């Protein structure tokens, strides 16, 4: 499958635009509500990725369990790429850095997202680049946690097809062979910071609900429970 078709398929697999409908409990309800709704469509997004359905059901749950928060946050960052000092969770749900105070430790997590958003601008991130990154995030997970991959190589095959798609995209974006090979580096180095926010988000979302302040969602809680933190 040629990469230029892979870039169109990644665009087609994109989940729909979602809408919504503040103190500590209200902030958490609103964000956890949006997470659970996006989690449902993220399942559909993954299935459309080439080779995903051919994986075992054991491997499909494994990648989604390991990367769901990373996948969420890169999506939230990408929706806020062109809105400064603001996190665009939904089109009608716009929050700034200030009102994270309502939740303890939230304002810390907002700044790392906003900085990653402001970074995306300076790099002039393109939509094709984001689609490969968000896809690469799903498959680069499940490289340790724990639990093993039944078909570890098949996942690497899908990862290399998206790698080649991102490479192909950069090869025809107006970049010389010097900056061509380095733009790939600048985009993949962002994956470490996103994973860092994942561990901070998971740990924050675990302190809550263990404080009995997160609403009962059966999908969100199954995804948090999939990490088995303490």
């Amino acid at each position: 499958m040629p990469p230029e078709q892979v870039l169109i398929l990644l665009q087609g697999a994109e989940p729909p635009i979602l809408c919504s409908r503040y103190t500590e409990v209200t902030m958490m309800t609103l964000l956890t509500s949006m997470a659970d709704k996006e989690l449902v469509h993220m399942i559909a997004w993954a299935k459309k990725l080439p080779g995903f359905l051919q994986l075992s059901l054991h491997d499909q749950v494994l990648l989604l369990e390991s990367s769901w928060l990373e996948v969420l946050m890169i999506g939230l960052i990408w929706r806020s790429i062109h809105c400064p000092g603001k996190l665009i969770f939904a089109q009608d749900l716009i929050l700034d850095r200030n009102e994270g105070d309502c939740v303890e430790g939230m304002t810390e997590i907002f700044d790392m997202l906003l900085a990653t958003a402001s970074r995306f601008r300076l790099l002039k991130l393109k939509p094709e680049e984001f689609l490969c990154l968000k896809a690469i995030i799903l498959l680069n997970s499940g490289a340790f946690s724990m639990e093993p991959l039944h078909d570890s190589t098949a996942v690497q095959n899908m990862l290399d097809t998206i790698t080649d798609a991102l490479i192909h995209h950069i090869s025809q974006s107006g970049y010389s062979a010097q900056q061509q090979a380095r733009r790939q580096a600048q985009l993949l180095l962002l994956l470490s910071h996103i994973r860092h926010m994942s561990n901070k988000g998971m740990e924050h979302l675990y302190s809550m609900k263990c404080k009995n302040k997160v609403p009962l969602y059966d999908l969100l809680l199954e995804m948090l429970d999939a990490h088995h933190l303490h």
Partner: peptide, 11 residues
């Protein structure tokens, strides 16, 4: 099983 197992085996 989970809701994940259900949503993945859907259509």
């Amino acid at each position: 099983h989970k809701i994940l197992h259900r949503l993945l085996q859907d259509s």
